[PDB]
């Protein structure tokens, strides 16, 4: 074995989200916590409520969490986001009427400044949350007005989507999936016979289950109630569905 860089006996490595491993020669594998080193925290992650309907409630609820955790620049930035996202500043379709809030210096420019600072600080968490929350004839003017209409530049949608993908991957790392769905809800780009019930016979249109073998199905809560106590097909088929439907 000519190519022999053999005597390997030490190594360090990052693993998980908040973890580190290393071993040495005198030899048990010692790991360590680095949660306070990275700019992201799981504790703050579990609390960050998000919503598409009531934006203000999300901002003011996230505001208290950072104070409950210890961070400060967020208990400022979230307040600024709250005051800079009210429906009173709603844009108007006509370009004549009033200057849009985007062109106000405290509008787009503030967003770019915050994004740049937190890009330097390398904190994908706050980037993801801020971006998610803030998300011949005279004809050739309304298009430009709609371009200037938005608080986020239409020419950098890709980076925002990348931020929102990366935070989802880290959330999957941590062990929370519902939050991974809430965050990803904002991303722009996309990701015979026999139709009756079997326990109440009313036509089903939404969520349902069935056996692969039996071929008898119905409403999901119906099956919860039915299989809470028994092990037979509800329609006199004889299948022990706990041995057929599941793997």
């Amino acid at each position: 074995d000519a190519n022999i860089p053999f005597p390997r006996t030490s190594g360090a490595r990052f693993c998980g989200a908040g973890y580190l491993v290393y071993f040495t020669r005198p030899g048990k594998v010692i790991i360590q916590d680095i949660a306070c080193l990275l700019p992201v925290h799981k504790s703050l992650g579990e609390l960050y409520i998000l919503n598409v309907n009531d934006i203000q409630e999300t901002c003011q609820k996230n505001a208290a969490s950072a104070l409950l955790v210890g961070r400060k620049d967020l208990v400022q930035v979230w307040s600024l986001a709250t005051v800079a996202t009210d429906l009173c500043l709603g844009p108007k379709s006509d370009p004549d009427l009033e200057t849009p809030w985007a062109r106000h210096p405290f509008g787009r420019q503030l967003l770019e400044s915050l994004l740049a600072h937190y890009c330097r600080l390398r904190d994908v968490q706050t980037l993801a949350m801020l971006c998610s929350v803030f998300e011949d004839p005279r004809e050739r003017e309304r298009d430009q007005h709609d371009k200037n209409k938005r608080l986020l530049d239409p020419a950098n949608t890709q980076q925002f989507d990348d931020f929102k993908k990366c935070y989802g991957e880290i959330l999957y790392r941590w062990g929370l999936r519902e939050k991974r769905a809430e965050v990803l809800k904002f991303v722009s780009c996309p990701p015979g016979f026999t139709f009756q019930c079997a326990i109440c016979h009313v036509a089903v249109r939404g969520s349902s289950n069935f056996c692969l073998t039996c071929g008898h199905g119905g409403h999901t809560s119906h099956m919860m109630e039915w299989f809470r106590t028994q092990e037979v097909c509800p329609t006199g088929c004889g299948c022990h569905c706990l041995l057929e439907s599941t793997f």
């Binding site: 074995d1 190519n3 860089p5 390997r8 006996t9 030490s10 190594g11 360090a12 490595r13 990052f14 693993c15 998980g16 989200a17 908040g18 973890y19 580190l20 491993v21 290393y22 071993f23 040495t24 020669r25 030899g27 048990k28 594998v29 010692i30 790991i31 360590q32 916590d33 680095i34 080193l37 990275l38 700019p39 992201v40 890009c119 390398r122 904190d123 994908v124 980037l127 890709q158 980076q159 990348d162 931020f163 990366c166 880290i170 790392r173 062990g175």
Partner: protein
């Protein structure tokens, strides 16, 4: 806190990698054995055993949970063994010996592409084993990939279809960067050569949206090079030194967000770097 598990091994330990959720711990060693330890609330208990590979083990890499529980092992024996497990027991699944020299490194590909496994063996070649399905794999080959043989391999973060790119470097200190054309050929693109003798490890930083691709390196002569580049599609790779220790550097690692680099080499020690506002890398511990 500090968590410690007793290895109960009889010979050396070469690598140790955990799982995606932080709920497993794998251990390679030269006893021709792998001992999987379940780490949870500070307790060392066994789950499986690897009693036979026909030789010592070098490097193991866990795969993405999306595809199940898959573990790979590249080692001294000239074989790469997978450990797909079923029904609560770990079992040998599939092996191939597409090399005539000890396998050096293995690194699991990004999950978007599929379930791909790059194998940089010591005989100047790289094999990319793709999962065809139904318990069948495809083994590609690129002969004469190195004049001294690639020491270690790494995968590039996926960007926006798709363009597969990965980086590797051998014992001729001529680290290169590959690519794949529409046909399926692994065409070469460039070759960085600002290295002294050999390059043991190569690691590529995770991508978090910043328009900048960062590659780490570690030469057999003490040097930790950070080959940053931010020229979009101009392809300008400008090396920048970080230090020069008193002995050979072995392994370079990254964080999730690419803010801390941990390099542990021949000095039987581990030092943690960073990237200051000015642009100099300093120690912390």
């Amino acid at each position: 806190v500090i968590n410690t598990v007793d290895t109960s091994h009889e010979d050396m330990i070469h690598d140790a990698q955990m799982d995606y959720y932080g709920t497993r711990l794998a251990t390679c060693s030269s006893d021709r054995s792998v001992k999987i330890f379940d780490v949870r609330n500070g307790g060392q208990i066994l789950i499986a055993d690897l009693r036979g590979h026909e030789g010592p083990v070098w490097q193991v890499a866990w795969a993405h949970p999306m595809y199940g529980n898959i573990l790979a092992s590249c080692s001294y024996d000239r074989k790469v063994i997978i450990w797909r497990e079923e029904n609560g027991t770990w079992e040998k699944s599939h092996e191939h010996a597409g090399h005539d020299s000890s396998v050096n490194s293995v690194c699991w590909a990004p999950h978007d592409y599929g379930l791909i496994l790059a194998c940089g063996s010591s005989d100047g070649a790289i094999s990319l084993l793709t999962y065809t399905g139904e318990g069948q794999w495809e083994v590609k080959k690129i002969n004469n990939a190195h004049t001294i043989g690639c020491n270690a391999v790494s995968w590039a973060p996926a960007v926006v279809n798709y363009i597969k790119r990965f980086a590797s470097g051998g014992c001729d200190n001529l680290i290169k960067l590959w690519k794949e054309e529409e046909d399926g050929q692994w065409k070469e693109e460039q070759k960085l050569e600002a290295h002294s003798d050999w390059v043991r490890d190569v690691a590529w930083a995770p991508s978090i949206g910043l328009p900048t691709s960062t590659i780490a390196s570690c030469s057999q002569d003490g040097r930790v090079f950070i080959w940053t580049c931010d020229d979009a599609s101009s392809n300008t790779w400008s090396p920048k030194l970080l230090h020069k220790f008193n002995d050979v550097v072995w392994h370079v690692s990254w964080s999730i967000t690419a803010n801390i680099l941990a390099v542990s080499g021949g000095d039987n020690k581990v030092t943690l770097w960073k990237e200051s506002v000015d642009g100099q890398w300093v120690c912390i511990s």
